[PDB]
Each structure stands twice: as C-alpha cells, then as structure tokens.
Design a protein around this ligand. Structure first.
Ligand SMILES: *Cc1c(COP(=O)(O)O)cnc(C)c1O
Ligand SMILES: *Cc1c(COP(=O)(O)O)cnc(C)c1O
Lengths: 400, 403
C-alpha cells in the first residue's frame, strides 16, 4: 500500500544480501582468527567480501578496511589525520564544505571547540549548491592535512567535483614536497553515490573514501578505502585491541555483516548502470508529474545549474504558508519520505541548514520534502504519491 | 565429526538468535530515526533489546548503550575516562588508571597507548602468581590522588579465574567517601565481563560497578556488543568517541544495526531465562573433562585452571601435558577431532610463544609452553569429552613416537 521514497535515508536489504548474511550466521560462525578449518572458512568469506568492495570502487583488496558503518569510517579518517600530523611534527588544518553529513561536520566542529585543530568549512556556492574547487584550493595552509568533501549530498543529491579537487590538490602537492611540506590528503564521503553512480577511486583520485552499506541495499556496516594503506597512505587507528583488520580496526570480525556487505557490493559492480538508469527514469518522470500537477507553485530544489546530481533524488517545495514539509508528509496516506537527514527528524519544523547553505530561501526550505526513489520504484508508484500529495496540499493550503 | 571446545574464542548462534536477526532484516529494515511507522517499528525492536540486555545484568534499559562489540566498549570506557578527568578539572595533568596484568588486548593496549603518548599514567597490577587473581589489597594500594578508573576483567579468558569485582567495588566505594571528604575526585570502576555472561550470574548491583562491557559472540549472540553505564547522565558521565547523527543519545551515533541488536537482545533473553542451566551443565562437563584427563595422562598432566581459594568459570579447563614435544599448538595440530586453542585467538599468529597470561599467573614456562585451552559449551556432552580425550592420547603418542 505505502510507497517508499526515502532510499537516501536507508534502503531495504536485497534478498541475496539477506541470504548471504543468513548462511554466514549458520555456516561460518567460527572466529576468523582461529587456526582450525571453521575459522579459516569465515576468513575466506571476509577475504571474498574485501575483494567485492575493492572491485565495486575500482581499488584493490588491501585498500579496504571494514568498519561498523559510515559514521565510524568518517570519524576514523578525521582521527587518523590528527594523529598523522602529530607524528609528522601549531595544529592540523582541515578543509571541508558546509553541507557534509553530521559524521563529518560534528567531529570537525568538536576538534575546533577543543582547540585540537583548525577547520575551514568552505561554504558551497549559493548558485549551484556545489562547493567550488577554487575556494578549496585557496583555503590550503602550510598546516593543511586533509580535504574532506562529500561526493554527493544526501539532501539535494548534488555531486561535488571530487576528481578535479584531487587533481588540483595533487598539483599543489608537487610544490609543497619540493618545499619540504607534507602532502595534503583527500577524502570523500561517498555514502550516497554507491549504487547510484559509478564510483572509481582512480577517477576520483582520492586517498580515502567512505563506504556505507545501508545506502546500497547492504547491512548496517561499512568500510573505509585507503589508497595503499600503510604504504602510500598513512592510517592511525582509533581502536586498540586484538589486531584484526591489520590492527587498523581491531575486534572480532562480524562475518555475517561482512558477507552481506560483500554481496551488496557485487550487485553494484554487476548492475550499477541498470540501477542508475532506472532511478533517473523514475525521478525524471516524478519531476515531470509534480510540475504538471502543481505548476508554478512548485520549486525543484535539486535542479541546480551546471551541476550533476544523483539520478534518484528530488528535493522539492510547494509554495504556501500551510505547506511546511513535515506537515505535508503527515497528511500523506501512502507516500513515505522525509524533509532532510533522518538524523534531524526531531526538529522538522526548522529549515534544513543544508538547503539554507545552498541558497534556498527560508520559506522554500521550510516546505522542502526530500523524495529519493529506488531500484524497484515504478511510474505507477509515482502517480500514486503525486495524487497523495495533491490531496495533502488541498487539505492544508486549500484551493488556489 | 569435530568436537568444538573453543567457546571462549567465540560461540555459534542459538537458533532463536539467528531467527531474530533474519526476521529483523526482512521486517524491520527502516531507519530507526524516521518519522513513519517503518522507522517506529525498528526502534521498538531496539528498545526491547535494550530492556533485554538490562534484565540480563540486573540493570535498567536507560543504562545500556549499544556498540559494535567488546573492543569498542572497552576502548570507549577508557576514552570517556580521560575526557571526564579533564572536564572535571576545567570546571599538563594526567589521569591515572588501575588494571591488572592479564586483561584482554582491548583493555591492555588502549591503556599502553595512553602511557606511550603520555596522555595518562597506568598501574598494571600484577595478579597473584599463587592464585592467578588480582588481589583487592594490591588494587587499593595502587590508588593515587589522580586515579579515576579501576578496570578489572570479571573473568580471565585463558584461565577462567574470576576476579573479586564485587569486593573491589565495595572497597572503592568506601574509599570514595574518604576522597569526597577531602574534596578529591571519585574513582569509578569498570569490569570487562565478556567471558562471564551466559556462564555465571552477572548482577551490576552485586558487582557494584559503574561500567560493564557486554560481548555478544561470547554468549551465542551476534558480533556486536554494549556498554552498561550506571545511571548515565545522572550518576555516571559518558563522553563519546564518535560524533554524528545523535543515535544512542549521542553516546554512540550511527544508524542503528537493527538486525544485530535484535539478535543480541534474543541472546540476552536466553541468558536471563537459562543462565543457571548453562552454568550447571558446563560445570558438569568441565569437571568430568578434568577427571578423564587426569585418568588418561596421570601425573603427566598439569591443570592450569585450578588455582587455590578462587572461583573460576564453569566451562574452562586450561591444561598442559609434560614433554618437550607437547607444545600446545603441536598437540592440537595432531588432533583430528578436537577444536580448541592455546590462548586468546587474538594471538594465534604466534602460538609458539608461551602465553604471557599464564606466565603472569605463576605457571612455569615449561608448563605454559604446553598449555591448551579447552572451553566447553551449552551442547557439550560427556561422550564428546571422551572422544577428545582419546584424540589427545592419539596426538600425544604421535608427537613422542619415532620421527
Ligand atoms: C548515511 C550517510 C553517512 C553515514 O551514516 P550512518 O548513520 O553511519 O549510516 C555518512 N554520510 C552521508 C552523506 C550519508 O548519507
Ligand atoms: C572476547 C573478549 C573481549 C572482546 O573482544 P572482541 O574481539 O571485540 O569480540 C574483551 N575482553 C575479553 C576478556 C574477551 O574474552
């Protein structure tokens, strides 16, 4: 009955993923560290999954480190960077943008509050909702250690120019090296891109990349890509313990979850283009129907000029004092969506800081609703929720 | 055809746990923070599991914080303590910790790290080489004006020896009244109860601790964990290691792993419902096991889990058979049925190095080098014991026979 359009918040598990998790729970329950066959069996599942993730993003198995999820992966990159700077050695400097996920913004703000590091939160262009390359390069100081920019924004869907950033940073690094300055590394939070658009680390040129399983129909765990970890790129751990994950992330491996993530990654490798095309077809049809139904009263908050965006995201607002996002969704009987990051669902009456950062007017941001379609969404489901929205609007704003 | 006796390394999942996880994956996949029924349904599964864990250890739901496993839980309490120390002062200087010499890597290493980085000072109290237990008097004797945390494992994973946590907590509570009188900050107590859950009753009111680590895969649950914090936000502070979405009341952000939490809650219910049965059964099997080992090997056997005057886990039997050729890993390499280990899995890459824990417990190097750790479980039978004992006899004879 309901129509789910909140895939950016989380995705359901593919049946093959569920199957993998289940078989691992039953068949490969042994401690992966144990010498006997049962332990070696779990280890192989883990090795296979590491290769799956590596293949998904075009990196190598040795560049993948499993973590409990996106939040851990993001905090890890930031924590490692601070340690690296102190080992190389005044505080480390970070460069990021104003629309990152809480797992990037907050750990950085925390470092600032504690006076451990200095951070330049580069405002995104209020024109295209994208961080601009020149603003990032201009922010680099002798103490700059890491540039962390999300590949795609979870609320707007806007793609950031990661590949250009890495390229410009590489160029600037050649000068720093000759000058005796350490290199500025680059990390990208790719949580919302995986499974929606091709993600290749060689194309992106990044040194770190965050992988989030529950964004691409996988389990609630994740990983962190680190270009030639320990050799080409340094990684200092947050956790200390039994030596798992080459001591970069100790703790008995969660084989079942890893198995699920691996299978999830395989499906992306094999079908990413199919998913992307279907999402784009559905999202475009969705925007077409919303425009036909609401005309001049609707504003498409995800259609910025000159920039790319996820194929599945359509953040929009309908003009009207009575059409606050959370009020509209409350009146919907079929549509399941959100007004922004799930992480902020306890204050839905407040305009999204992210949309405001993107130049979206306050009253437009207050009425914003984020629709994010998925692999299974159909045109018939789009029609259903457009009609659901029509009734919700007519009830709140009334006829115009 | 194999007989598993390495439950202290990890345990298989109970059928019900597996079902709980599978059900959650299929029916409760929504984001717990979402403003619609799908999200509300996952949150309820999480709340139920929180209550389940609380009941298992005699605490309250509000005092349970889910984590990714034992390692995270242990690192978290140590991190939080460092933060707390400085915060209280702010309201150059280093916090002091007290632990013992036989803690798991997830307690020992984070503490060594702080010492190396000059972030804190730590007193690694040596356990008794007589009873392999850390003594209450030695811990209290190590207390300094700057001591803020005493962390002692409830049960050792290699020997099975039970540490006097309730008495440690009692003596610290009395000391804190004296410290408060002079205006000094209080000393908190944490216990790594990884190896005790599901094997013996664990009651936070009995133990008197402020923090307690819970490890799912040690009691037939999923590979995640939790941290008990006594009246968190009211009687005990907890400073987060991770920052982000506000989940777990911001003590541990990150979209909740509902299926794993579902499994953990179910594993906890089983312990709550059947702990006495599990314990009594393990004790019977383990005691029968030692009887048979002594019967078959006689005076050649050394029982390394039989220290005088102390309690021990009901399922553990660490032992050694004398002989230059009977190194633990060598013996196990010859076994065709028995599945065990020579120490914490975490150190399997160097099974040829005598256990530092056994050595710290007074076990002579000749005995320590030949140690094998047998840890039985809920399903282990006396028949299976007889099998591995014959498997050991066979193995021993091969090792000592013509080259
Ligand atoms: C989902 C997401 C994350 C990770 O969040 P978790 O709660 O740990 O799953 C990080 N960044 C972005 C942009 C995301 O959408
Ligand atoms: C298993 C165990 C832990 C936790 O270890 P993980 O590898 O994170 O599951 C902590 N302490 C002790 C004594 C343990 O046996």
């Amino acid at each position: 009955r309901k129509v789910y359009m909140d895939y950016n918040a989380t995705t359901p598990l593919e049946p093959e993923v569920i199957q993998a998790v289940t078989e691992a729970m039953k068949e490969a329950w042994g401690n992966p560290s144990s010498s006997y066959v049962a332990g070696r069996k779990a280890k192989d599942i883990i090795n296979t999954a590491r290769a799956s993730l590596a293949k998904m993003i075009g990196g190598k198995p040795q560049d993948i480190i499993f973590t409990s999820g996106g939040t851990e992966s993001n905090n890890l990159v930031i924590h490692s960077t601070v340690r690296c700077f102190h080992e190389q050695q005044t505080r480390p400097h970070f460069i990021t943008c104003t629309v990152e996920h809480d797992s990037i913004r907050l750990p950085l703000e925390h470092l600032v509050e504690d006076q451990v590091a200095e951070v330049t939160f580069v405002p995104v262009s209020k024109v295209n909702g994208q961080v601009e390359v020149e603003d990032i390069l201009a922010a680099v100081r002798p103490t700059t250690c890491l540039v962390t920019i999300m590949l795609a924004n979870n609320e707007t869907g806007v793609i950031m120019p990661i590949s250009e950033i890495s390229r410009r940073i590489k160029a600037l690094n050649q000068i720093r090296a000759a000058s005796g300055l350490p290199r500025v590394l680059v990390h990208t939070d790719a949580a919302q891109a995986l499974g929606k658009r091709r993600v290749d680390v060689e194309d992106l040129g990044v040194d770190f990349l965050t992988i989030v399983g529950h964004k691409f129909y996988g389990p609630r765990i994740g990983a962190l890509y680190v270009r030639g970890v320990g050799k080409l790129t340094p990684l200092y751990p947050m956790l200390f313990g039994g030596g798992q994950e080459r001591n970069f992330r100790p703790g008995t491996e969660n084989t079942p979850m890893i198995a699920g993530l691996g299978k999830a990654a395989d499906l992306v490798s094999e079908n990413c283009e199919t998913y992307e095309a279907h999402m784009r077809d559905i999202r475009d049809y969705l925007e077409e129907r919303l425009e036909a139904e609401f005309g001049k009263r609707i504003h498409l908050n995800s259609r910025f000029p000159g920039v790319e965006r996820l194929p599945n995201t359509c953040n929009f607002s309908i003009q009207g004092s009575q059409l606050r996002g959370y009020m509209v969704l409350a009146q919907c009987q079929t549509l399941l969506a959100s007004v922004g990051a799930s992480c902020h669902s306890d204050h839905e009456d407040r305009p999204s800081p992210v949309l405001l950062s993107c130049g979206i007017p306050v009253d437009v941001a207050r009425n914003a609703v984020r629709l994010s379609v998925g692999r299974s969404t159909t045109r018939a489901e789009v029609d259903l929720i457009v009609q659901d929205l029509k009734q919700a609007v007519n009830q709140l704003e009334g006829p115009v």
